[PDB]
Amino acid sequence: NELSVVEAELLLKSSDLVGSYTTSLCLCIVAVLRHYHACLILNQDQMAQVFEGLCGVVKHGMNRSDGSSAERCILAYLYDLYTSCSHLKNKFGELFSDFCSKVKNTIYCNVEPSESNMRWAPEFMIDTLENPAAHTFTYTGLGKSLSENPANRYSFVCNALMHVCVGHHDPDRVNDIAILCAELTGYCKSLSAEWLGVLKALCCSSNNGTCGFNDLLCNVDVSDLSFHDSLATFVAILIARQCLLLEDLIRCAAIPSLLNAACSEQDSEPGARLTCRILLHLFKPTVGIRSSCDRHLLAASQNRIVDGAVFAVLKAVFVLGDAELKGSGSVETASLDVYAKYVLRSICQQEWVGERCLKSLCEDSNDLQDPVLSSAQAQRLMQLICYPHRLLDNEDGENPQRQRIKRILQNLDQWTMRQSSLELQLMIKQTPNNEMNSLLENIAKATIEVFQQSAETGSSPVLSSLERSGVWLVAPLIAKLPTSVQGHVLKAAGEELEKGQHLGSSSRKERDRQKQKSMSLLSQQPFLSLVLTCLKGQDEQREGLLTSLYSQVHQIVNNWRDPKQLMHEALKLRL
Amino acid sequence: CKRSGRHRAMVVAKLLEKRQAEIEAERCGESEAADEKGSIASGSLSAPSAPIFQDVLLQFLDTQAPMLTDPRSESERVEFFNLVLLFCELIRHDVFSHNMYTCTLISRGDLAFDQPRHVQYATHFPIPQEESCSHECNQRLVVLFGVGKQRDDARH
Amino acid sequence: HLEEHLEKFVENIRQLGIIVSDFQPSSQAGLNQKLNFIVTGLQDIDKCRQQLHDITVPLEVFEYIDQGRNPQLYTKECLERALAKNEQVKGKIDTMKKFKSLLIQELSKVFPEDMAKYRSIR
């Protein structure tokens, strides 16, 4: 915040550090502060000086319209703090009205992109592309050449992709050529609208005409799968300055590559592998950057995007693992069916992805509303969302949905509360309207064994005793379930209390141990807690559970003729 | 360990740094006027010595760490990683009664005598309150680790 | 020296025993009394070592540390008064120098012959 006074003091001394040391290293401060935006936005007293301090430093830059990318990105973060707080609208609302139109006009280049058909020459503007590694190229004049002709930006992209693959793959050199690519793209106002082909033609290698600009496929090799690590890092720094928007990135890059991933032969099966790598590192030898802020720019830049694309990413991952491949050729020479599944597990092995998806499904179940998935193929899919390192479950029986229920209830704890409850509530809409009876018998036999396993745990602090006694936990999970489920299990809880007296056939030896278990079921307060929530909204469930209260009250009045007053509360609970 | 993000960790310290001193202080001033009952209340004088404050919440958290000092198990490592920063920000915002938070660990440190967890606690808890007082911060760091001057080289 | 280390260990053991006795001592609380006795023995050994050293201290620093005064600040006033009196006598000497300078030039201007004779004599 107090670099503004330093800028005002050192303006008169007039070194080269004006606009450079207080702005380029300011972005390093910005990158850490953007990455911890949630801590700053939480408390509303320290951050008020931050917007005041950031404004006073760049108070000679409110009226920018053709500035550099680093000048725009800090002012984009100035827009980010202003947008993420309504209380910043009050004190600097007078200096934002002129600031709103000039900043947003750079970002509002939303239009159908230029579909020009210039005959692609692989030699255009060879002066910069001959050796851009040297610092002899002044970078203020390079942006003037790109601004006068849009075709200069196209030819710069075409030949730089030749240099990253043919040349040595050092991680330090590719960072420097990405920095000049990032600053020159954000140097002018409307350079983000011309990216229509390279985001598709780098991956779509089996269309040949639908994308255009065939020099993108021509001058570089496709089968090499080593320089795309540098390419994925290069576009990661490129998107970190908001040079790649997301309003038409789906129309330009994503859905052309989705059809060419799963439904492709070996002509674009390495191209199908290129679909995986550009999206795996988009949100998550190796490109080892020394700057730790550069490894955390993408996590900082992810705050402006939402969960509106991850389910679309994992949609094509399943279909890439669904359409069988045999002509592949063990990382890439094997099939891309299992390699898509490797992407599927490693995405949810990230702890950020698992918590962010489960809170979204708790908000609304429309994240996984796509009917492309089958029954059991979707059932294992959210189990990856439930747990990444889980074993692959067994094959289906006559009741595939019932076996999915029984596995999650054998291992109940507090931490898997919502993902178990999410697994139930997706299953009532995935079951069609002709076969709820199939789901009704699925919740018949799977819930009577819950009643057995609640008895089995009964037969053989608070939180440690809670997780061994998940019948305490399943009743709030039942409480999330709709009223058809509780009405159905009252029939299920009714019939097990009917057979409690009838087992043994009034034996001297066999009935009494079963009747010992029957009054034991009365003794466990889980069983009353299971049914007291169930007494709301039931029309015919009287006769079932009261058969237990028939014979239990009959024996105790004969047992009373025989711990002085322990049975008194045992009689209040039936009242 | 399942859900993470230390934006939650800042909230719980900041949900409770001000609430422990603004709803108990309304009843502390009621206790501050009626705390003079004979020699026993004068011998204690709990309210005028220090305001009444929410305390002894540290004893719910010291039990849940058998050997929580290792990264070899992945789930409990981020449990321990969250544990020390949460203990740090209670001291940073003065969330807890640090007058008695210190004395309990002194009593645990004194009555302690593969190392025991109370030795593992005071070794690895980060206190951000620096240069406050030598009789509270500096002299506490010395006496909690036995006798021996080889620790001064790591100080160097 | 080792007497200071023994006194510091004595203070640390006394503070630890005070904290242990203030709390509920579950273990053998006689270990604290043994630590206090060892502290007293170390203090006696330090007294014997200082008796071999034969170090002398005046009593004014005792009420200074009763106020809590660090020895460094007592040395501050010691060096301050030494330098101040040095400056005072230096200023007195310099004023004496300029006074006899006016004496020499006055005796030269009114009495040239005997002043020149004494200049020859020295």
**A230 burial class (0-12, 13-18, 19+ CB within 10 angstroms)?**
buried
Chains contacting B (3 or more CB pairs within 8 Å): A, C
Token code pair at residue A121: 């020459």
User: Which amino acid is residue A489, in one-letter code?
Assistant: V
**B36 burial class (0-12, 13-18, 19+ CB within 10 angstroms)?**
exposed
Note whether B14 contacts A43, CB cutoff 8 Å: yes
Exposed e or buried b per residue across B100-136, where buried means at least 16 C-beta atoms within 10 angstroms of its C-beta: ebbebbbbbbbbeeeeeebbbbbeeeebeeeeeeeee
Taking contacts as CB-CB distances below 8 angstroms, the residues of chain C near B109 are: 19
Nearest Cα to Cα of residue A326 among A343, A318, A338: A338
Of C9, C15, C26, the CB nearest to B111: C26
Min Cα distance C27 → chain B (Å) is 7
DSSP designation for A286: -
Number of structural domains chain C divides into: 1
The residues, ordered by sequence, that sit 6+ positions from B3 with a Cβ below 8 Å of its Cβ are A355
Note whether B103 contacts C9, CB cutoff 8 Å: no
Residues found in chain C:
122
Of B111, B139, B142, the CB nearest to C25: B111
What would the DSSP string read from start to end of chain C?
-HHHHHHHHHHHHHHHHHHHHHS---S-THHHHHHHHHHHHHHHHHHHHHHHHT----SHHHHHHHHT--HHHHHHHHHHHHHHHHHHHHHHHHHHHHHHHHHHHHHHHH-HHHHHHHHHH-
Q: Specify the experimental method.
A: cryo-EM
Note whether B14 contacts A351, CB cutoff 8 Å: no
**What whole-number distance in Å separates Cα of residue A357 and Cα of residue C17?**
55
Q: 10 Å Cβ neighbour count for A155?
A: 21
Using the Cβ of C70 and the Cβ atoms of chain B, whether some distance falls under 8 Å is answered with no
Domain that holds residue C50: 1-122
Token code pair at residue A452: 């057995």
**What whole-number distance in Å separates Cα of residue C44 and Cα of residue C61?**
22
* Distance from the first to the final alpha carbon of chain C: 58
H-state helical runs in A503-545: 510-523, 525-532
**What whole-number distance in Å separates Cα of residue A157 and Cα of residue A122?**
11
The residues, ordered by sequence, that sit 6+ positions from A560 with a Cβ below 8 Å of its Cβ are none
**What whole-number distance in Å separates Cα of residue B53 and Cα of residue B24?**
6
Note whether A354 contacts B14, CB cutoff 8 Å: no
Q: HEC states along A16-58? A: CCCCCHHHHHHHHHHHHHHHCHHHHHHCCCHHHHHHHHHHHHC
Token code pair at residue B122: 């005071």
Exposed e or buried b per residue across B50-77, where buried means at least 16 C-beta atoms within 10 angstroms of its C-beta: eebbeeeebeeeeeeeeebeeeeeeebe
Angle, helices B117-124/B98-110, rounded to nearest 10 degrees: 140
Token code pair at residue A438: 């199939």
Chains contacting C (3 or more CB pairs within 8 Å): B
**What whole-number distance in Å separates Cα of residue A408 and Cα of residue A405?**
6
Degrees (nearest 5) of the Cα angle A427, A432, A437? 80
Taking contacts as CB-CB distances below 8 angstroms, the residues of chain B near C16 are: 110, 143
**A407 burial class (0-12, 13-18, 19+ CB within 10 angstroms)?**
middle
Query: How many alpha carbons fall within 13 Å on the CB side of residue A497?
Result: 25
CB A421 within 8 A of CB A478: no
The H or E element that residue A141 is part of is helix A139-148
DSSP designation for A291: -
Of A42, A351, A415, the CB nearest to B4: A351
**What whole-number distance in Å separates Cα of residue A257 and Cα of residue A280?**
14
The H or E element that residue A498 is part of is helix A483-502
CB A320 within 8 A of CB A258: no
Residue pairs spanning A and B at CB distance below 8 A: 20
Task: Compute the Cα dihedral for A433, A435, A439, A440 and give only its sign.
Answer: positive
Alpha-carbon distance values, A476 to A526, A530, B2 (Å)? 12, 9, 20
Backbone angles phi, psi at A24, to 5 degrees: -75, -45
**What whole-number distance in Å separates Cα of residue A346 and Cα of residue A353?**
10
Of A38, A351, A355, the CB nearest to B7: A38
What are all long-range contacts of A253-260, with beta carbons under 8 Å and residues at least 24 apart?
A253/A199, A253/A200, A253/A203, A253/A278, A254/A309, A254/A312, A256/A200, A256/A203, A256/A204, A256/A207, A256/A210, A256/A211, A257/A200, A257/A203, A257/A204, A258/A315, A258/A316, A260/A203, A260/A204, A260/A205, A260/A206, A260/A207
Min Cα distance B4 → chain C (Å) is 37
Angle, helices A483-502/A436-459, rounded to nearest 10 degrees: 50
- With tokens 């967890």, the residue in question is B117
Residues found in chain A:
575
Note whether A355 contacts B14, CB cutoff 8 Å: no
Nearest Cα to Cα of residue A379 among A402, A359, A356: A402
Note whether B11 contacts A42, CB cutoff 8 Å: yes
Alpha-carbon distance values, B51 to A134, A357, B27, C70 (Å)? 68, 45, 10, 33
Do chains B and C have 3 or more beta-carbon pairs under 8 angstroms? yes
**What whole-number distance in Å separates Cα of residue B120 and Cα of residue B142?**
15
Residue of B7, B18, B73, B74 to mutate, testing the A interface (most A Cβ within 10 Å of its Cβ): B7
**A143 burial class (0-12, 13-18, 19+ CB within 10 angstroms)?**
buried
DSSP designation for A539: S
- With tokens 């002894």, the residue in question is B56
CB A352 within 8 A of CB A392: no
The residues, ordered by sequence, that sit 6+ positions from A326 with a Cβ below 8 Å of its Cβ are A335
**What whole-number distance in Å separates Cα of residue A447 and Cα of residue A222?**
55
Using the Cβ of B11 and the Cβ atoms of chain A, whether some distance falls under 8 Å is answered with yes
Token code pair at residue C76: 């501050």
The residues, ordered by sequence, that sit 6+ positions from A34 with a Cβ below 8 Å of its Cβ are A77, A80, A300, A301, A303
Closest B-chain CA to A386: B2
Taking contacts as CB-CB distances below 8 angstroms, the residues of chain B near A415 are: 2
Of A38, A39, A415, the CB nearest to B2: A415
Taking contacts as CB-CB distances below 8 angstroms, the residues of chain B near A38 are: 5, 7, 10
Alpha-carbon distance values, A362 to A311, A422, C91 (Å)? 15, 7, 88
Residue of A351, A352, A415, A462 to mutate, testing the B interface (most B Cβ within 10 Å of its Cβ): A351
**What whole-number distance in Å separates Cα of residue B128 and Cα of residue B91?**
7
Q: 10 Å Cβ neighbour count for B9?
A: 16
Note whether B110 contacts C27, CB cutoff 8 Å: no
CB A56 within 8 A of CB A4: yes
Token code pair at residue A463: 């939180």
What would the DSSP string read from start to end of chain B?
--S--THHHHHHHHTTTTTTTTSSHHHHHHHHHS---HHHHHHH-HHHHS-------GGGTSSS-SS---SSSHHHHHHHHHHHHHHHHHHHTT-S-HHHHHHHHHHHHHTT----HHHHHHHHPPP---SS-IIIIIHHHHHTT-S-STHHHHH-
**What whole-number distance in Å separates Cα of residue A566 and Cα of residue A571?**
9
For chain A, how big is the Rg over CA atoms in Å? 32
Degrees (nearest 5) of the Cα angle A229, A230, A235? 100
Min Cα distance C36 → chain B (Å) is 14
As a dihedral over the C-alpha atoms of residue A433, residue A434, residue A437, residue A440, rounded to 10 degrees, the angle is -30
**What whole-number distance in Å separates Cα of residue B26 and Cα of residue B22?**
7
Exposed e or buried b per residue across A247-282, where buried means at least 16 C-beta atoms within 10 angstroms of its C-beta: ebeeebbbebbbebbbebeeebbbbbbbbbbbbbbb
- With tokens 């075709």, the residue in question is A151
The residues, ordered by sequence, that sit 6+ positions from B63 with a Cβ below 8 Å of its Cβ are none
Backbone angles phi, psi at C87, to 5 degrees: -65, -40
Q: HEC states along A101-123? A: HHHHHHHCCCCCCCCCCCCCCCC
CA A370 to chain centre: 16
Closest B-chain CA to C11: B143
Nearest Cα to Cα of residue A93 among A57, A37, A44, A51: A51
Q: 10 Å Cβ neighbour count for A398?
A: 7
**What whole-number distance in Å separates Cα of residue A269 and Cα of residue A263?**
9
H-state helical runs in A205-268: 215-218, 228-239, 249, 255-262
- With tokens 């001057």, the residue in question is B149
CB A216 within 8 A of CB A198: yes
Min Cα distance B107 → chain C (Å) is 6
Taking contacts as CB-CB distances below 8 angstroms, the residues of chain C near B107 are: 19-20, 22-24
Note whether C20 contacts B143, CB cutoff 8 Å: no
Using the Cβ of B133 and the Cβ atoms of chain C, whether some distance falls under 8 Å is answered with no
DSSP designation for A467: H
**What whole-number distance in Å separates Cα of residue A533 and Cα of residue A475?**
8
Min Cα distance C13 → chain B (Å) is 9
**A465 burial class (0-12, 13-18, 19+ CB within 10 angstroms)?**
exposed
**What whole-number distance in Å separates Cα of residue A311 and Cα of residue A384?**
13
Token code pair at residue A130: 């001959």
Taking contacts as CB-CB distances below 8 angstroms, the residues of chain A near B3 are: 355
User: Which amino acid is residue A421, in one-letter code?
Assistant: S
Token code pair at residue A4: 């503004």
Using the Cβ of B85 and the Cβ atoms of chain A, whether some distance falls under 8 Å is answered with no
